[PDB]
Symmetry: C4
Subunit: 362 residues, 4 copies
Amino acid sequence: PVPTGGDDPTKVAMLGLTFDDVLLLPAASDVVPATADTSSQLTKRIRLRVPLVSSAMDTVTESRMAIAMARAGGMGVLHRNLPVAEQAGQVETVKRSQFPLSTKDSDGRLLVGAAVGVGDDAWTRAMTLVDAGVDVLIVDTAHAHNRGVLDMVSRLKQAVGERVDVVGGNVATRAAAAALVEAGADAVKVGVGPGSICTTRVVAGVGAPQITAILEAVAACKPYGVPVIADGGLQYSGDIAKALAAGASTAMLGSLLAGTAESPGELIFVNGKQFKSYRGMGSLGAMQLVPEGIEGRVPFRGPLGTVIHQLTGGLRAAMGYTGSATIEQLQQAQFVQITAAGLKESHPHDITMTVEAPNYYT
Amino acid sequence: PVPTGGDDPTKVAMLGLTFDDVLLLPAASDVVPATADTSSQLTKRIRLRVPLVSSAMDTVTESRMAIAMARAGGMGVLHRNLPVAEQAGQVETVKRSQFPLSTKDSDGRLLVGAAVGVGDDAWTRAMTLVDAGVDVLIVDTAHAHNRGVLDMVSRLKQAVGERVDVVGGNVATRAAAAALVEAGADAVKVGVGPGSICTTRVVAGVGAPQITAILEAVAACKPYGVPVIADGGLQYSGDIAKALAAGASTAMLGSLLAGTAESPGELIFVNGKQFKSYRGMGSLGAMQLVPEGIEGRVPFRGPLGTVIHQLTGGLRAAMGYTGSATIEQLQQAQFVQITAAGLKESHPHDITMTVEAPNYYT
Amino acid sequence: PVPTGGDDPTKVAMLGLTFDDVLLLPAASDVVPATADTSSQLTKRIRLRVPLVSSAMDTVTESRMAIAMARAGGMGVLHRNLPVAEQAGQVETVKRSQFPLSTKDSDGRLLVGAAVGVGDDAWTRAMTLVDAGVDVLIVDTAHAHNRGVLDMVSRLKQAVGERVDVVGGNVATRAAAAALVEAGADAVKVGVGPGSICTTRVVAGVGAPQITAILEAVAACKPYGVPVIADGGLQYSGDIAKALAAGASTAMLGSLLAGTAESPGELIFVNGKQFKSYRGMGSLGAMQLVPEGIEGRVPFRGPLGTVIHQLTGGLRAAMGYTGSATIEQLQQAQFVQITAAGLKESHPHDITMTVEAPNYYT
Amino acid sequence: PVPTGGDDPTKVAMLGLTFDDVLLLPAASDVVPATADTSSQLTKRIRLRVPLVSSAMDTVTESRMAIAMARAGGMGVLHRNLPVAEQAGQVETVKRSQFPLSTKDSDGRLLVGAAVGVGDDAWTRAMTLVDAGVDVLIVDTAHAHNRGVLDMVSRLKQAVGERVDVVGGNVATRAAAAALVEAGADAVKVGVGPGSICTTRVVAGVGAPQITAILEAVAACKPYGVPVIADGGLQYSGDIAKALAAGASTAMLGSLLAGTAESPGELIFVNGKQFKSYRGMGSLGAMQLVPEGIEGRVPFRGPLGTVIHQLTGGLRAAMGYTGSATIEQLQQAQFVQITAAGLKESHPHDITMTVEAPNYYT
Ligand SMILES: NC(=O)c1ccc[n+]([C@@H]2O[C@H](COP(=O)([O-])OP(=O)(O)OC[C@H]3O[C@@H](n4cnc5c(N)ncnc54)[C@H](O)[C@@H]3O)[C@@H](O)[C@H]2O)c1
Ligand SMILES: NC(=O)c1ccc[n+]([C@@H]2O[C@H](COP(=O)([O-])OP(=O)(O)OC[C@H]3O[C@@H](n4cnc5c(N)ncnc54)[C@H](O)[C@@H]3O)[C@@H](O)[C@H]2O)c1
Ligand SMILES: NC(=O)c1ccc[n+]([C@@H]2O[C@H](COP(=O)([O-])OP(=O)(O)OC[C@H]3O[C@@H](n4cnc5c(N)ncnc54)[C@H](O)[C@@H]3O)[C@@H](O)[C@H]2O)c1
Ligand SMILES: NC(=O)c1ccc[n+]([C@@H]2O[C@H](COP(=O)([O-])OP(=O)(O)OC[C@H]3O[C@@H](n4cnc5c(N)ncnc54)[C@H](O)[C@@H]3O)[C@@H](O)[C@H]2O)c1
Ligand SMILES: *c1nc2c(ncn2[C@@H]2O[C@H](COP(=O)(O)O)[C@@H](O)[C@H]2O)c(=O)[nH]1
Ligand SMILES: *c1nc2c(ncn2[C@@H]2O[C@H](COP(=O)(O)O)[C@@H](O)[C@H]2O)c(=O)[nH]1
Ligand SMILES: *c1nc2c(ncn2[C@@H]2O[C@H](COP(=O)(O)O)[C@@H](O)[C@H]2O)c(=O)[nH]1
Ligand SMILES: *c1nc2c(ncn2[C@@H]2O[C@H](COP(=O)(O)O)[C@@H](O)[C@H]2O)c(=O)[nH]1
Ligand SMILES: [K+]
Ligand SMILES: [K+]
Ligand SMILES: [K+]
Ligand SMILES: [K+]
């Protein structure tokens, strides 16, 4: 019999690795961290100076956050939890608005992104957003291997292909990424359940660990040149370095940017400290059922520029350790799989911390 | 030599997996969660609309709980901690009893099951229960591979085989499932020690992880058309989805229904909060000795209908993710094996929950 | 290269399993738990009705504990931290002494054993103890593969081999067990580091997991018919069942008996709860340097007979589950390896225990 | 495909083991712990009586620590966070200064070492240190596979290779160790991330577990007779024994020596208990940016001699257990891999320690 039970060797397909299961192996390096080139292709036509994209969530990205992310070298994606006219107004506000790395189009204006669903109402929203000058559309769905999501992606590529870039929803397998690539998507977003606010892997018991999912999606997408975006489950800059090394071209950040000042919402004072609200788009409050997210609060951090600077410094240090001149070389790095004891050895241990580092906290 | 010690390669037969060791892999889907069919076979001749069955415990299932569970779309199994006359009276009360999914017999009365032991006194109890008009008998023992349990199953199926269905006791291996099938069981119940109130794996050191046990039992029960019931260890709707995807046709629930309003027992107030008593049938109090269970308390949950609806919504979401229109299709889904890091990535992390979700609580 | 580093495949010899890594598999059973025979061989000539032995520690075994253990069906081993005259007096007190299971010699006197070290002083102590009528001598060391221990075992076997039995020191490998058998020992004690009070694996970094060590030692001792004693690391009756199923013949208990009324020492009262002292023989206090043990307290348990009955009931339940009429049949049961999630499923989970079980506590 | 994902079997190159994943197997022994010889090679020409070195940290080693370590039988390495003239003054102070094991040169003067960076200013500091009477230069970096570090090592060996010994920076792979040996290093230091105060594996996500790294580096250094120094991650004397058995010849200590009276800094009182500062060299304060270390405090220990004696006693116990007369014989001991349960069993468990032992802390 099969060692794990039954007579079917393909019942348990594979062992899945996540960010905490692997470490990057140092290699022969001739690269100073300051000279590392952290530019990467977000889509087949858009290249960012910093490969970080803000999450399309109602407590993460709005006009201010989108403008700040575009100025810092990345991009912001406005959420679709607003009326269509309001979303178009936010797109116009971003496009209408020191920062040498800022992302700009052929007209010299900042780049913005918008998220739409699936359906005729979503089609009207997408048409309104495209008419307002949006550059990239995201078909933001929880299960992108559904036939409706693929049909919507094909429709958008057929209609507004010459003017915008269409990014498919979340996938976690090789077959889903291949289907999205065949459907005509310009970029594939990866991750089902690893988000810090998600309960999908608990409520439905469905998902896949992020590192293995990224590897599978890259094996499905790289021959066609389609970029891969790692979405959800990133907590440190080492996580971003690992996600890029596993094959992803861009990383989408949630809770790391929710505690910044540019994020929408009011500051909450609790017990002499500061926080702000963070919740999933599938949470009960956001969808007003069977929710697949939770509501919570993250500690307050400050300006987005400092956070992006620290994350980029960590990524530059990783590139220096691996000897990667560009991201295209960082994607050829190798991993070492570690156990739980190795995981606790990686973090600071046997020490009582008396002052916090800019890039680390418990 | 064997890597784990000794010269016998069969001393450590296999590596067992449980619910938290696996995740369900998304597949190509054309299924909407609202339009998925959750009906499944409880026995070879009885089909439920919601594949959930209440545990035969004195703190979980009685007349009220059996009626509520039959109305909700599943079934209840009355415990055998009562005198035979009282259990027969409970059966008659259930049979003497808005609800589109209610499970009914040919005459229009609600279905109900009843648990029996092993022996001549249990034989008299079984005859009384059959006379009172029960639909399915459960030979409720902790070890179904014993000779007495098989003899009792054969005797019951020869006596009242044409009238009621007989479900075999708890098994954890393929050989025991095959023995139950050969003895003439209409359904096989799986699980030895995974219950939240069990100490059998600690007191006796005997057991088997639930996912591996379900796979092993299904490998022997499926060829003969005998359904498999997964019993014990389920704490989320994702666990139910994983159990069904492993081959089981129905799931039997304990502590998940012990805190509802329909379960027997008075409310308990601790620090201003509500709880209800929950204890194993092998506990010292319940068996009144070497006990194999403990006595405890679980938080109050409210009406059973809300709990059943939340669990069924989670199962429907899992069916949508896997592209399974029917439970028979869900039983063909695949798994991915995860580590402890993947397990803590599955749950919400790096967040302080500010408001509790209807289907998730830490 | 080897996947764990280096070019030598024998550098990391094996993967070691302990009690928490394995579970007993149920088998076809015709055994009532009350009809199982728990008798087992302590040495090649001594048979115990209950296969449990007390540890030769100054906080566990003295004359009272030895008498109680012999009255319950097992045996006690007197510690050697006393002067030779006092130890001989304790042996005489035990021999000079309602209990149908009492283990007696031909003359109807309770059996007892004593511990000796290595050296000429140990030779004088051993001869004095043999004069006082001791029944079995334990060469109580921490490393039985040392030349001195084997030489001493050979000397004792040549001198007083017919009168008494000689038990070898603690081993952890197949080669050490083979050397002890060749030296002429009548029983082999297994375990290096798993003691609840030991720090040998942390201070010296030397040890082996108990299940793997037992399997390896049985691979060498069984062909010659030399019994195996599992010593250290046992916390539950399921652990005793696992140790006996792995191949061992008897289990030597430490902390499980230190909290009884018969153990030497006085009660300790702290915050309305009762404790008593427990310490290793390598501790700084016991050896009065680089200690290899610690000093602590364990909760009070009451009379030893109740504890012995609970452990025997757990063992009988395990034998009933595995279909083992005798311990010799229990030594052929199969294991299943479990993960950490399986381990947390094995214990009572997701519950708030209200009343204490006689054989379980968190 | 690869069971972890993708089509490249070399993406996840290997599985790394740390100190907590292995144990030393006992073997046939004719060695008394008090008669073992712990002398080991520091470099190709320097042999220490106690194979322990102090870290080049501004909170660990200064003149006093170097003198105490040289007297105790090891050696000290002065940190380079000081002005060049000040560090040369510390070197002269150490050279200008019961202890039968003290390490001395051919002129009866205490040995000492100093750390240098990479660059022309580092060249000036190195030349000043050589002219000031240093015995060994440690090219102290974080990534020694960089071209600059190899060039600096080659330049130092070409200039003052006949007067001083050059030890390369930290490596974690076989290729890096081979490159350092080819560059002309007298010794190779191993470890990237294991430090108790490091955050490199979190900020950059780059590193390797220590046991696998030591094995890989020894696989490249042993054929050429170049010693390997294990730096970082050692918390117990068992860790030192494991590192020596993996192939390392010496172990550099950080936090283990940062709480002694001879370490630089001042005593700190918190709730009646004594602590003192310990911070990483890449921490924010130490480099005064993206720090790769943290600042904290460790409990006060006392005189260095007692700590060194306890560590050497643990090492001698390990040598006695493995039957290793010399460190060269300890470097051939075998390992056994353990699980998380094995690690829990190795430490004291199910006990409430009431008095702290000299060599173990809870
Ligand atoms: N599912 C489990 O793992 C588990 C474990 C312990 C108790 N329980 C529950 O406790 C209640 C009583 O269980 P029970 O089986 O002890 O009832 P019981 O004492 O009435 O036993 C009935 C029959 O089961 C068999 N049996 C049970 N345990 C055995 C063992 N250890 N060895 C050999 N044969 C054995 C015997 O043939 C016995 O006559 C039931 O409600 C049961 O579901 C369940
Ligand atoms: N990434 C995740 O795993 C995840 C999980 C839950 C929610 N979310 C977020 O919540 C928001 C709403 O997501 P949504 O998908 O629930 O909204 P939605 O109702 O707009 O779903 C969009 C489409 O996704 C597909 N889909 C979604 N869930 C499915 C399921 N269970 N089975 C089959 N097809 C399914 C369907 O084709 C549907 O039309 C988005 O912002 C999304 O990113 C994400
Ligand atoms: N069972 C264990 O793992 C363990 C561990 C430490 C101590 N202890 C207990 O502590 C007491 C003293 O133990 P002890 O045996 O160390 O004391 P001891 O001084 O009586 O040692 C007796 C003999 O054991 C051998 N020995 C012990 N440790 C050795 C080592 N590290 N290397 C080589 N040979 C070694 C030597 O031959 C020595 O003569 C005993 O009661 C013993 O049971 C037990
Ligand atoms: N061993 C470790 O893992 C580690 C990590 C961080 C810091 N540290 C300690 O902090 C201090 C300063 O460390 P440092 O090496 O950054 O000092 P540094 O800034 O003086 O660097 C010296 C040389 O190391 C190399 N180097 C260091 N980090 C590199 C990277 N990320 N990518 C490429 N090359 C790199 C370069 O050749 C550089 O010129 C030292 O005392 C060092 O031991 C050690
Ligand atoms: C699950 N996932 C959800 C939900 N809303 C958004 N998301 C996903 O999480 C990502 C961010 O996760 P972090 O780990 O916090 O960075 C988002 O980009 C989105 O893909 C939800 O309700 N449940
Ligand atoms: C162990 N298992 C026991 C006992 N009484 C009942 N059971 C089993 O547990 C199931 C419920 O488990 P939950 O995890 O709480 O859902 C029951 O259906 C029954 O099979 C006992 O004393 N010990
Ligand atoms: C380590 N082991 C020690 C010491 N003294 C005795 N022992 C061993 O432990 C066994 C008891 O272990 P428990 O887990 O408490 O059952 C004893 O029988 C003996 O073999 C010591 O100082 N260090
Ligand atoms: C990471 N590692 C660092 C830093 N400064 C020094 N080190 C390394 O850590 C070792 C200390 O190890 P312990 O575990 O504390 O014994 C040092 O010897 C050095 O090699 C730093 O900022 N980050
Ligand atoms: K670390
Ligand atoms: K359990
Ligand atoms: K999650
Ligand atoms: K221990």
